[PDB]
PDB file of C-alpha atoms and ligand atoms in Angstrom:
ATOM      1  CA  UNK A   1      93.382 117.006  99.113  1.00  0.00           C
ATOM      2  CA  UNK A   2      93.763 120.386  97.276  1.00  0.00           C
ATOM      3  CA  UNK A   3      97.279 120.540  97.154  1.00  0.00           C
ATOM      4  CA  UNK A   4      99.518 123.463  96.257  1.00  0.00           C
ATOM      5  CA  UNK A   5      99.844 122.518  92.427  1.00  0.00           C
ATOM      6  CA  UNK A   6     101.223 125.978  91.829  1.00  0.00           C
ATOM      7  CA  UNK A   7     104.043 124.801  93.936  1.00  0.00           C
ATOM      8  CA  UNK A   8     105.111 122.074  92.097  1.00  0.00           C
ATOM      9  CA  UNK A   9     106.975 124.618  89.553  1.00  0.00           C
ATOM     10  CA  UNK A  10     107.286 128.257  88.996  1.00  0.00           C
ATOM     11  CA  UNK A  11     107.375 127.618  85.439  1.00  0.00           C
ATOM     12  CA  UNK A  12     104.571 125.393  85.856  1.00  0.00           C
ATOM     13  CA  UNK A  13     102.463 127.516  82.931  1.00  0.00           C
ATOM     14  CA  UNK A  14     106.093 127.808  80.553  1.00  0.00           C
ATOM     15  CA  UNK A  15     105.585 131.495  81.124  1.00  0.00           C
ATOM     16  CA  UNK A  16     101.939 132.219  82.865  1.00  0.00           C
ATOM     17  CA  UNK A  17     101.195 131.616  86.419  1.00  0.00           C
ATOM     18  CA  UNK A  18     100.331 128.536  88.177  1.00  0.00           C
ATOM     19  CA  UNK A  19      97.195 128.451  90.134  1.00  0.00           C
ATOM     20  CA  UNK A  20      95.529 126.571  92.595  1.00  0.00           C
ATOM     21  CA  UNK A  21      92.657 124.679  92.755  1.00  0.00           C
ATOM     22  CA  UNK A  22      90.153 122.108  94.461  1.00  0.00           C
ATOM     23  CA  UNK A  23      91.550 118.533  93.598  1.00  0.00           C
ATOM     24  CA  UNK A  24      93.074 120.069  90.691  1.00  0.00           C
ATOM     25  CA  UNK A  25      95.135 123.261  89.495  1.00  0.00           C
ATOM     26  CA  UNK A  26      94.997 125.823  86.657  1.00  0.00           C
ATOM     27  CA  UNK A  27      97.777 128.246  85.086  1.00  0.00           C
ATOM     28  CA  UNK A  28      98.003 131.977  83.343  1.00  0.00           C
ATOM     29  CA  UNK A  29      99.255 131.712  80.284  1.00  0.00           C
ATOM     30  CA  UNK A  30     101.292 134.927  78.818  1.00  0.00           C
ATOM     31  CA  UNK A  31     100.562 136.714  75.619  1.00  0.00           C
ATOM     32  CA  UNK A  32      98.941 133.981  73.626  1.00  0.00           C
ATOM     33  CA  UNK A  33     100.124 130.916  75.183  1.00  0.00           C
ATOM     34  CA  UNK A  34      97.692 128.334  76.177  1.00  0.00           C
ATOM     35  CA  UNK A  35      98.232 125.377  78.830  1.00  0.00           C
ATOM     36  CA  UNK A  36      99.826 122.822  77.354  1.00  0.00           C
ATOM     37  CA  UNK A  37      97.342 120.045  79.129  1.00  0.00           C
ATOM     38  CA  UNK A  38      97.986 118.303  76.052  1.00  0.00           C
ATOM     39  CA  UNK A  39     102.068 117.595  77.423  1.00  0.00           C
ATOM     40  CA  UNK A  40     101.431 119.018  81.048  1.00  0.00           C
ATOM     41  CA  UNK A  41     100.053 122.225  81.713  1.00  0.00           C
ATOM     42  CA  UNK A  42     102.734 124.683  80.577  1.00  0.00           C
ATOM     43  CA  UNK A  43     102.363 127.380  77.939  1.00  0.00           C
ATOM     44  CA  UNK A  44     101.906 126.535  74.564  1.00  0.00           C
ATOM     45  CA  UNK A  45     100.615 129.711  71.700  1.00  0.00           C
ATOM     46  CA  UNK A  46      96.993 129.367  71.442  1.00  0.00           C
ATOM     47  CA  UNK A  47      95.008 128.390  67.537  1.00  0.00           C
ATOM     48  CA  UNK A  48      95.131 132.030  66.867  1.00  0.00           C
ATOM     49  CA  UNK A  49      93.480 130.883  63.382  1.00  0.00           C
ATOM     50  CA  UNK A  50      90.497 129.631  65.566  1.00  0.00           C
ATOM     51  CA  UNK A  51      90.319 132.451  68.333  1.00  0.00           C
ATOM     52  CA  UNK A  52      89.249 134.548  65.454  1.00  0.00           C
ATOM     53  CA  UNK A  53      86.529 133.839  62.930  1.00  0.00           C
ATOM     54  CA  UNK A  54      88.184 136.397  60.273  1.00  0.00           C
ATOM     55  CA  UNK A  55      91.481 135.406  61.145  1.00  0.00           C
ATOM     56  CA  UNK A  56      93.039 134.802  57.538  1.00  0.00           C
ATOM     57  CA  UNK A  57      89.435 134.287  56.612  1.00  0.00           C
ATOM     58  CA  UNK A  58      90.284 134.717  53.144  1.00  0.00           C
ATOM     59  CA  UNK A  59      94.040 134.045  53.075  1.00  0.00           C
ATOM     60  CA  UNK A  60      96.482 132.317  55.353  1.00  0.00           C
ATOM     61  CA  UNK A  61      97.052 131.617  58.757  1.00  0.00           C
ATOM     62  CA  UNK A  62     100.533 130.556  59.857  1.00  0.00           C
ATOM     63  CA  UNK A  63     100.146 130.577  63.682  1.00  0.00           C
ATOM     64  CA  UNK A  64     103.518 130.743  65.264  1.00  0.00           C
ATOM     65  CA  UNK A  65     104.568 130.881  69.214  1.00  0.00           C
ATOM     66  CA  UNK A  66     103.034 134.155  71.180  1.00  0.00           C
ATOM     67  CA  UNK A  67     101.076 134.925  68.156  1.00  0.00           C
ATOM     68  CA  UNK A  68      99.910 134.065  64.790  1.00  0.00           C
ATOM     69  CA  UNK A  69     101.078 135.377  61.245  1.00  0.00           C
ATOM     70  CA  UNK A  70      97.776 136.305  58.426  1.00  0.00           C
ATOM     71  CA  UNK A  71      98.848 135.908  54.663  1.00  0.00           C
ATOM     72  CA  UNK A  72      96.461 136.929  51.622  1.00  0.00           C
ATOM     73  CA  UNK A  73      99.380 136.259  51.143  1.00  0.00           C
ATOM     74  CA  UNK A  74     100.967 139.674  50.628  1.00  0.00           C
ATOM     75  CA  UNK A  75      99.835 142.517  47.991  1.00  0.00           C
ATOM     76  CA  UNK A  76      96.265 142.730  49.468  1.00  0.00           C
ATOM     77  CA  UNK A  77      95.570 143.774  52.438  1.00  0.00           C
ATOM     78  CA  UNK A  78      95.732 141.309  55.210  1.00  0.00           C
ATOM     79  CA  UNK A  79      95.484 142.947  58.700  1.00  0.00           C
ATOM     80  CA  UNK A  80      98.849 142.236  60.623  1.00  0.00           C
ATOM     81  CA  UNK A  81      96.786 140.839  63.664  1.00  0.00           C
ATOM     82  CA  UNK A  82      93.140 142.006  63.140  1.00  0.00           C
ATOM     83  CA  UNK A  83      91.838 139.046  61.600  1.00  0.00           C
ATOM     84  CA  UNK A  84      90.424 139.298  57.885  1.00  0.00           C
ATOM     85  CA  UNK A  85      92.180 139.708  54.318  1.00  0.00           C
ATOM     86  CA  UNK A  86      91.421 142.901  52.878  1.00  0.00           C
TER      87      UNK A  86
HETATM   88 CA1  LIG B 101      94.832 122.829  94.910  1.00  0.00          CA
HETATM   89 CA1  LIG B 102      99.688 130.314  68.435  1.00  0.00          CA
END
């Protein structure tokens, strides 16, 4: 058992780095990119509007790829990547 999952692929994670594990296998993601168990295990952006209880708190939260995008929208004073309209 405990095969080289890592091996299978070197773009296992999509972008992070595959590693290996005990009947089983893990990955590390890049900037916000989380395994994407839910197609394989690559890397797919993380629910930036849930890593963050403030995150767009009070406005929007249009999470994109690698990141996430806060909207009060505009005019306020939404922080770019801080988390909480202001
Ligand atoms: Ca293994
Ligand atoms: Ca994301």
């Amino acid at each position: 058992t405990d095969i080289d999952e890592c091996r299978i692929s070197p773009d296992l994670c999509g972008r992070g780095q595959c590693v290996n594990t005990p009947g089983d296998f893990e990955c590390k993601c890049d900037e916000g990119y989380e395994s994407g168990f839910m197609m394989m295990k690559n890397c797919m952006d993380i629910d930036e509007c849930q890593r963050d209880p403030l995150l767009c708190r009070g406005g929007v939260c249009h999470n994109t790829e690698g990141s996430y995008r806060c909207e009060c929208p505009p005019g306020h004073q939404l922080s770019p990547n801080i988390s909480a309209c202001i």
